[PDB]
Design a protein around this ligand. Structure first.
Ligand SMILES: *[C@@H]1O[C@H](CO)[C@@H](O)[C@H](O)[C@H]1NC(C)=O
Ligand SMILES: *[C@@H]1O[C@H](CO)[C@@H](O)[C@H](O)[C@H]1NC(C)=O
Ligand SMILES: *[C@@H]1O[C@H](CO)[C@@H](O)[C@H](O)[C@H]1NC(C)=O
Ligand SMILES: *[C@@H]1O[C@H](CO)[C@@H](O)[C@H](O)[C@H]1NC(C)=O
Ligand SMILES: *[C@@H]1O[C@H](CO)[C@@H](O)[C@H](O)[C@H]1NC(C)=O
Ligand SMILES: *[C@@H]1O[C@H](CO)[C@@H](O)[C@H](O)[C@H]1NC(C)=O
Ligand SMILES: *[C@@H]1O[C@H](CO)[C@@H](O)[C@H](O)[C@H]1NC(C)=O
Ligand SMILES: [Ca+2]
Ligand SMILES: [Ca+2]
Ligand SMILES: [Ca+2]
Ligand SMILES: [Ca+2]
Lengths: 13, 195, 399, 927
């Protein structure tokens, strides 16, 4: 499965 | 005057009864028309704020908050009983039938009062109050009222009329997630009504 | 702060010390095709104990650590010296590259985690090892409700204790997951007043409001509550509003959709220096002379638009500001970037006081060291610098 | 005081000058700079002792100073700034708990909290040449204080002229060499070394024998003073915490409580790096020690003080943080009246350069245009007055007059008028001063009966500072204007405020020739001296006293004073140069007071203005300007008897030795006025002297004696104290039926003449006393000024919002006060509205309304010389008015001229609703 390049975002405050 | 307010507008080279862009007619036939395409009845007695300079906005236009009573007044019309225009200096409430109670003192109708405000009973029987570079109120004999503002301000005020951007539903209860009490019911003049 | 995991999950845990953010094998179970990694986040405060915001982000991969301490650049190298915008470690094709308003990295795997210089954090996998994720990101499996378990693998019912469970091993004094004492929660009355136009206004969903096309790609519903909550708990200054809006703007822009202007009508516009061409949408990876100037291009440079004051028009962008085309644009030494001759320390032994001639494509260094009763251990978020050996204390007692 | 060198040397000193503690011998070789710090000493409490006063750090071209006089604030290069003054690569000074710390790139680091402790961490590199009083960095105790000799006070810088000598007597009460202290017991000064107590950890970590012997000297100097107990134990506790230890609570309310500015509470282990206005925690090593002190809650330390509310941190223009609303004048020479913008932008308006004679300069911590002139009025004798300048016109007045009054209003100027009452029958006068719309009585016939508003004001401050400096009493407002009153007729009115031309009167401002050409408001041609008195009359006269002796034989005995001397030959023997009773003749010309001395009255007969009466005035008021007075009572022919346990002195710096820990001593003109000083462990307080047993109370600006019950404004109960334990400012709103008024000169709230109740159990008594309730809903006009009377009443047509609301029983729902300038409307339930927008509940307007929350949740309203209204947490309401408004107001409440009958409470019509009922806030009334 090559189609789940994912991201993690941390938003300030 | 004219049945719909258009005064002090120099168009085509002269002052004329030509409609201005800033126009929120309130409860004319019990339907409120914002600066956009919107119509509804408040259906709630009290003093529900209709317009004011939105807090913290950059334009130097002075605070011009208004408060329209929803008292039934003449035969349950819910027309604006007293336009308590809380100008920055103080209350300049104007009454059609009786004399103006400006700052708590009854004063003569055809006289300027407070600062940069012109008040006068209409010869037909209504009462006009105007603010230079500001809002005006053409409070009628039968309670007809249109809050009128110049074209200079666009989406620079947040009240019951809301934005002037002319978007029909972006001011009516906003869009998606928002907390708009378009019927503010500010409680400084509103009764506590707690039980 | 406000979180968005590798999994489809968002949460608002508050913290005081380092917590495991990302990583793959906390227990090391999957010993096949094994390229383990680990990244941690830390939360600080600036006056109000109600919430916390990101201060230093730390990662550890392939015998190499990385850290950003909420400033222009650096703190990532293991030796302790700060690193510039483009830099190549040359071991395992690792290179940190920072966008005009971003800061990403790459390796032989291509791991790319981008943290802004001020509380805006984003991670992205290299698609190297994607199987299991160890850290605040959670398992990152299709399901989003199973992400919260303890590093020991046990079921976690107490998500407020999750951060401490995954916190950096050791003792952390005065690190409370939640405000133990009385917490100054913002009153409900000011939220209706402050949410209007001019204060978290454009962020609210509206066709008339700017970037209405940006709403379809990225939902700002999480952004909406965050704006009100972190302006009402705050004193109400306008900078908080600008930083809240810019995050959603950048997110939905990098999602692919273009943005029309909103800075002017909202009253918040960046007074960027030199060329400072503010653009609604402009290319990422601005023109910067690579410290190698010959190595392969990062795969992330071919990407969507980003809102930021591009300086590339006229002068190029280098060393976090604008530098003319004849400017130094880095020293280019062993895949390492030295910026505008900041007189850096090359190594921890303190001997190398190296001034950079960036236009000369070389460095001029000196062999001196601190000494003088100040040994040259690593300073907190600084170059290899002097630190006193011992300082006594004279007590001027009073009655 | 005692102290330990970084070397470990323990030694002690007591001094009053300004010394230095840490200073490099020379300029450092390279990579570092001079950092010399100077330490000030004062004699505080008794004699032969010293508490530290200030430390001044000069480094990198910036002089940063911290004094005990101003808590938690820094002084930079002679001006007040904010403490989070983050410079570049240096001087990262910030507030750390009770202390403030100067941190630098160089190893120098200073920690100073005031209150008798300074610590200066010095790097090991600064070891070869360190010449501060802290001693050499070799860390050998024996080789300390070797160059300067055995003197622990040899090093000094500057200082007051009288620092060297404590008194003409040899510094009374050296402490007991044997330390015969019954307080060696653990009850007091016995918690720092006694094991198995709250200081157990450092009992092992910190050897307390070095620090114990300082506590015993405190008992010797003063018997169990809380002000001597609180500082030393904290001083040891801080150095103990320097090396981490989990200390127990040493602070007990019985032993030593502590008070802090608003919204600051005490914690033994708190953050050492709180976040300032630039919301950056100091980058230097933090959380090293959790210091004791006071920590703001739900706030941040703005400018190093006040625990400002969140997010109102002001402008960062030019790097120096400037607070919200501060008129920076940041540019040199007061070029621009820049104002700190609401959102951190430096709003700059190009202001004027101010009056030409004034100068823009830095003094008293602020920089702006300040007066540069100087003036003098004397008014020595009872009848005798002196004009503003020139010759003496010598009025023999006998009725209340006005010495000086403003004749042209000015924006920059302030209210200023001083009148001499003259008392009666040509006797010594009694002074009153009018400043800032307030009246203050400087002094009276007795020693001190300072009137102000509360007749009890021993040593008090406010917009004006009054000092009971020995025999005389001195007064200076916010702007320096010196007022003096010997108790006898003598005055010395020093007016340097350059209101040139705009002043007229007896001391009338017409500069020029000696004639001074006094000008009447209409026209002056000088008919006679009596005409000047007739023209100048003041209100409040009892009967309009006549002016002039019957046959005017009063000045004709002067002829008999020529036939025989019949005058002060001895005065001529003393005012003359070989009379050493006056050496200030260089300071002030004696030729006026000389013929004042000859022609006071018939100096040997008739009306008695004696040598005793008036001789002392000149030599007791020439101390205003610095002067040395040799004993005029050399033979003590006129005995200046002392109350008790006291000995007289020409130089009595009663500024020092005040019973309070507060000292608005105005500098005492940097001199000691005449007086009898008490001895031993004396503590002076408004005459009576007590030997250091009871003067343990001190408040913000008013000294409170033992068992005092001082109540401040707003009537929030009282700051009652007790010598054993107390100083707890109990807070409680005044109960209904009383108002905060000066009854017989007491601020304690009492029943005012005017009491128109509304909601005291729904009671409506008239100000007069007729009882009839509202019994109907609406907003009702009650305290209506009667129109067209031109009295002080405004059109504050109060509209009582008596609505059902809570429990549907017509308690006060809201208030509605027009006040001629607004529509002030407060609700006990939700907020306080001004002009239609709600504001913070504890906010008051002197010109409009005094709104503040009572502890139970109640709110009141009050006008400066206006009406007052009560509002309980649940509906409650009283209207307080002073009967100075005798009638002259017609609302629902009657006139209150003092007659029940004349108002007759609306006999022909209802005063509440038939009349005086508002309709502007009523519905249309037509369906
Ligand atoms: C995942 O692969 C690379 C690595 O960052 C990235 O550029 C790409 O956009 C991702 N894949 C997709 C389909 O977006
Ligand atoms: C009601 O709203 C509609 C919408 O325009 C319109 O008919 C009018 O403005 C209002 N009054 C009546 C009587 O319809
Ligand atoms: C595992 O989780 C945390 C992390 O160390 C630890 O504190 C806890 O005691 C452990 N719990 C179990 C069930 O082993
Ligand atoms: C301390 O430094 C200041 C800075 O100029 C200087 O004026 C002062 O004389 C110095 N004090 C001593 C005792 O050297
Ligand atoms: C001085 O005398 C002259 C002569 O008439 C007069 O005009 C002037 O006002 C006097 N100035 C004073 C008294 O200050
Ligand atoms: C203060 O407390 C009571 C009040 O009357 C009194 O007995 C006591 O003696 C007073 N204190 C002193 C030191 O006199
Ligand atoms: C009503 O209350 C007021 C409050 O002071 C009081 O003066 C008055 O005597 C009371 N009258 C009656 C009849 O209780
Ligand atoms: Ca709209
Ligand atoms: Ca999952
Ligand atoms: Ca030594
Ligand atoms: Ca009466």
């Amino acid at each position: 499965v090559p189609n789940y390049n994912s991201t993690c975002w941390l938003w300030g405050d | 005057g004219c049945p719909s307010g258009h005064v002090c507008e120099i168009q085509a080279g002269v002052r004329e009864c030509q409609a201005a862009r800033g126009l929120c007619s309130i409860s004319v036939g019990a339907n409120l028309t914002t600066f956009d395409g919107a119509h509804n009845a408040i259906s709630s007695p009290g003093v529900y704020e209709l317009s004011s300079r939105c807090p913290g906005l950059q334009k130097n236009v002075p605070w011009y908050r208004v408060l329209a009573d929803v008292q039934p007044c003449h035969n349950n019309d819910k027309i604006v009983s007293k336009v308590h225009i809380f100008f920055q200096d103080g209350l300049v409430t104007v009454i059609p039938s009786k004399g103006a109670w400006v700052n708590g003192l009854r004063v003569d109708l055809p006289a300027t009062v407070l600062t940069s405000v012109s008040v006068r009973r209409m010869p037909d029987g209504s009462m006009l109050v105007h603010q230079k570079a500001g809002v005006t109120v053409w409070l009628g004999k039968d309670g007809l009222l249109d809050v009128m503002v110049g074209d200079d301000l666009a989406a620079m005020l947040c009240g019951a009329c809301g934005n002037f951007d002319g978007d029909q539903t972006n001011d009516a209860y906003g869009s998606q997630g928002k907390t708009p009490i378009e019927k503010w019911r500010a409680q400084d003049f509103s009764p506590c009504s707690n039980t | 702060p406000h979180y968005n995991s590798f999994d489809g999950w968002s949460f608002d845990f508050q913290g005081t010390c380092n917590y495991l953010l990302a990583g793959t094998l906390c227990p090391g179970v999957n010993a096949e095709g094994l390229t383990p990694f680990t990244v941690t986040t830390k939360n600080e405060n600036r006056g109000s104990p109600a919430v916390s915001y990101v201060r230093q982000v730390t990662v550890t991969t392939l015998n190499t650590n990385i850290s950003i301490h909420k400033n222009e650049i650096g703190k990532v190298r293991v030796n302790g010296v700060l690193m510039a915008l483009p830099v190549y470690l040359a071991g395992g094709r690792i290179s940190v590259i920072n966008g005009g308003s971003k800061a990403v990295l790459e390796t032989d795997f291509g791991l790319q985690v981008t943290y802004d210089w001020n509380w805006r954090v984003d991670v992205t996998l290299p698609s190297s090892y994607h199987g299991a994720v160890c850290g605040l990101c959670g398992n990152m499996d299709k399901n989003h409700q199973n992400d919260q378990v303890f590093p020991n693998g046990t079921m976690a019912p107490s998500i407020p204790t999750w951060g401490g469970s995954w916190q950096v091993p050791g003792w952390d004094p005065l690190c409370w997951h939640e405000c133990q004492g009385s917490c100054p929660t913002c009153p409900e009355d000011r939220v209706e007043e402050y949410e209007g136009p001019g204060f978290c206004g454009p962020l609210a969903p509206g066709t008339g409001s700017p970037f209405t096309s940006c709403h379809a790609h990225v939902p700002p519903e999480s952004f909406f509550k965050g704006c009100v909550l972190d302006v009402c708990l705050g004193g109400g200054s306008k900078d908080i509003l600008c930083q809240a809006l810019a995050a959603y703007a950048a997110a939905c822009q990098a999602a692919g959709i273009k943005i029309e202007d909103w800075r002017t009508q909202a009253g918040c516009e960046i007074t960027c220096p030199d060329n400072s061409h503010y653009e609604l949408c402009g290319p990422p990876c601005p023109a910067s002379c690579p410290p190698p100037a010959r190595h392969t291009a990062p795969t992330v440079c071919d990407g969507p638009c980003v809102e930021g004051c591009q300086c590339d028009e006229g002068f190029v962008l280098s060393a976090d500001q604008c530098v003319p085309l004849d400017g130094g644009c880095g020293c280019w030494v062993n895949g390492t970037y030295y910026e505008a001759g900041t007189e850096f320390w090359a190594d921890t032994t303190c001997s190398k006081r190296c001034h950079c001639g960036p236009g000369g494509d070389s460095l001029v260094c000196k062999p001196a060291s601190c000494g003088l009763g100040e040994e040259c251990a690593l300073l907190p978020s600084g170059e290899i610098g002097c630190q006193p050996t011992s300082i006594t204390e004279c007590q001027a007692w009073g009655d």
